[PDB]
Amino acid sequence: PRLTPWKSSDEVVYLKGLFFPADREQISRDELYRQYEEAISLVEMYSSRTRVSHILQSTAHLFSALMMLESFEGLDDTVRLTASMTIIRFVNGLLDPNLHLLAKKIDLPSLFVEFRHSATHDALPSLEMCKTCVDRAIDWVWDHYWDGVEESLIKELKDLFKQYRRIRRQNGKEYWTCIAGIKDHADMANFYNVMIERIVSNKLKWEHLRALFEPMMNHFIHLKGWDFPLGLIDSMLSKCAQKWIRWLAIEQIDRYDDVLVSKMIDTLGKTLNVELLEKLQSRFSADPVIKDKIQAKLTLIVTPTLHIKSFESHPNWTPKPFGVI
């Protein structure tokens, strides 16, 4: 179980996008260098939290160093140093898990062998040569490291929810617990909304679908981190579904909190159809500064209030794996 600086695995293939455009041409010759500087401050950033693969880290310098070798147009001594040192370090790093033989297996180009030697023991190699190197090496990493680079759970969640539908249907206890357990199974995934498609599935009638649906919606709300209650609507934006939203609108007013209000501002944008906002706008009623603010949003076709924290232990808290707040 190795440790990864990039919290998602994912931001890696995103760090191949910036370093390499792929749609390399045709693009602005400074957009190369605006993307590179997010990726260079990330590898620095990615490097800062924890060690990063040497191969990866050197890319970060190599690209920046190349940035040195273009923006340039005077006294070149410093810029034969940045790129030389990076190349020299870069080669020095690649080699050292332990000489003519060693390069051949390693496959570092022979010239790549020379430059470290020449810069180290000789006149600074010319900037024009370095460009050959910095680029040449850069191709190298792409050549090697860069170029190369549930069902059961779902069913159980579904079962749990379905169990809930039966429990309500009969119309504290351990069975009460069964509902609580379900809530965690939906927090963990990003598919909590996926149920929402499911809840619609149970519904056969107005309110009565709500009546069984309704107790949960309030309860999910009552414990904190009830943004998902805002969150579900985000799923809702895809928008029978509409009926839920209005009740969501009716329910939201009931959830009369600034964050709850906040969802609506977030909520209003999700709802392109005039009616959803209007009911939204209508409910807001345009009296608060936020109420004033919302109209601006509506017009468009924003932070309401301070959010405060303290050294107080979270009151209700479940195991979260250094992720998902």
Binding site: K7, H54, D96, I308
Partner: protein, 506 residues
């Protein structure tokens, strides 16, 4: 092939503690963590003999460290009132089981478990086991000189007044072994009892310091076990180097050192007489760090464990000793444990090692609002402001204390997290409060979620919250412990399953 004196019948199997009567020509060897009063006699351990009168003492000898032998080797005027059926052999040692819940490390890491007293002749199972049959694990010994050199000072100690004292050694030098060897001798209440004053300046191999700290620590009692600084010896200030080694902030590190000997200077002269350790580095700059140190200290004495010396030569009087030194399995990895251990201590000698998720963690809000005001980055200060907030997360950050007026200072970018430029940061007086690990940070409320090992709730009026992210790493187990990958189905917020060409930390 170290073996300890073995007693049977005379040996008593007693409940929750072990008491033995020891023949004069006998030695006792103990693994583990035990509290020890003595019943009748004088026991000299590692050249220190402790009388019957003295109060029980707590030992946390670890498997990796060399054991401190408990010699019967034996008459002390009383004073010490020794004290049960049989007079037997000349000395009567009392052993009591210690519940410190150390040895619980086994739960977190499979390899780590064996270090302490748990099981994994007829022997009852407690925290402490004596290895009667000679076995591979080491027994404490030193060249007499090594004992003598620390020993020699003590007589000076009895007389007035203050001796300032330095050591220097390689990282693997075993001086750290050297520096706790001393503190026992001067302390022993056969001697002037004033609290020896103590300074630790090596972050890399700190003692009396959870990792990446330098410490002045007034040592009053006798740490008889290879405490990792897990037990508390009162200290005025830890101080956060933020780096494993002096190099990361030579200016910060040197500027800090001088601000610690001051308090030391205040009590350097105040009966208690100063003690110090130096970075293991002797090669290159850290000698200039040792030599620069020597002059400021005006230390009475100095010690070096190896010859290679001349710069150290002037102007202080110096002592050259044997390499000594001492499974870890790797000494370098031990750092994580000293680092990890900080969190799992409810109180000294009591550590819960259930993974740190399952507790209710602490929120504070990253706003000009008091609980947390700002964060600042040591080392690289050019982390883009929109990447700082994600950098702190899944890291082992340390919270700080600054005065409010100073606190106002010049945060740079208020939205989200108000970054504090480093250059401003060094200048202000800072007082450290506690280590922290933050499980996650919420963008949505700006509230941030952090674990801290233990605290009094940090009440203050308008002392701005202080943060810093140094170089200290994170032990893997807390995130990925087999315990927290079976109760959390495998997925990696930050972690991955085990191969491409080519990518592995240089």
């Amino acid at each position: 092939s170290s073996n300890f004196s073995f007693d049977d019948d005379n040996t008593i199997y007693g409940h929750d503690y072990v008491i033995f009567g020891l023949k004069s020509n006998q030695n006792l060897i103990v693994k583990g963590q035990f509290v020890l009063e003595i019943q009748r006699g004088a026991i000299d351990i590692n050249g220190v003999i402790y009388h019957s009168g003295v109060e029980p003492m707590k030992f946390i000898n670890p498997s990796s460290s060399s054991i401190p032998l408990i010699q019967a080797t034996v008459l002390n005027s009383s004073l010490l009132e020794n004290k049960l059926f049989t007079p037997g052999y000349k000395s009567v040692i009392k052993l009591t089981n210690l519940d410190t819940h150390l040895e619980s490390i086994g739960r977190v890491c499979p390899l780590f478990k064996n270090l302490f007293w748990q099981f994994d002749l007829a022997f009852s199972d407690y925290t402490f086991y004596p290895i009667t049959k000679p076995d591979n694990t080491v027994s404490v010994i030193k060249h007499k000189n090594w004992m003598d050199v620390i020993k020699s000072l003590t007589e000076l100690y009895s007389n007035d007044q203050s001796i300032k004292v330095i050591v220097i050694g390689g990282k693997n030098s075993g001086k750290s072994t050297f520096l706790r060897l001393l503190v026992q001798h001067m302390l022993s209440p056969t001697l002037q009892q004033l609290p020896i004053n103590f300074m630790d300046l090596d972050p890399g191999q700190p003692e009396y310091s959870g990792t990446d700290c330098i410490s002045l620590s007034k040592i009053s009692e006798v740490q008889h076990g290879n405490h990792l600084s897990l037990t508390s010896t009162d200290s005025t200030q830890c101080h956060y180097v933020g780096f494993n080694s002096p190099k990361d902030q030579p200016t910060r590190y040197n500027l800090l050192v001088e601000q610690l000997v001051r308090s030391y200077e205040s009590d350097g002269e105040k009966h208690e007489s100063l003690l110090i350790n130096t970075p293991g580095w002797i090669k290159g700059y850290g000698l200039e760090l040792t030599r620069t140190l020597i002059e400021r200290v005006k230390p009475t004495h100095v010690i070096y464990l190896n010859s290679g010396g001349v710069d150290i030569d002037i102007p202080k009087g110096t002592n050259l000793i044997p390499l000594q030194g001492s499974s870890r399995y790797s000494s370098s990895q031990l750092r994580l444990l000293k680092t990890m251990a900080y969190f799992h201590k409810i109180d000294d000698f009591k550590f819960d090692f259930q993974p740190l998720l399952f507790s209710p963690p602490i929120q504070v809000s990253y706003g000009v609002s008091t609980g947390i005001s700002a964060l600042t980055h040591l080392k690289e200060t050019g982390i883009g402001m929109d990447h700082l907030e994600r950098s702190i997360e899944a890291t082992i950050v340390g919270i700080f204390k600054v005065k409010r007026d100073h606190l106002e200072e010049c945060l740079f970018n208020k939205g989200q997290l108000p970054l504090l430029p480093y250059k401003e940061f060094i200048k202000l007086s800072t007082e450290f409060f506690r280590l922290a690990l933050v499980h996650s940070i919420d963008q949505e409320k700006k509230i941030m979620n952090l674990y801290i090992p233990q605290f009094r709730t940090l009440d203050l009026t308008k002392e701005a919250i202080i943060m810093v992210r140094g170089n200290t790493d994170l032990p893997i187990w807390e995130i990925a412990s087999n315990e927290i990958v079976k109760r959390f189905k495998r997925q990696l917020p930050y972690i991955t399953f085990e191969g491409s060409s080519l990518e592995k930390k240089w």
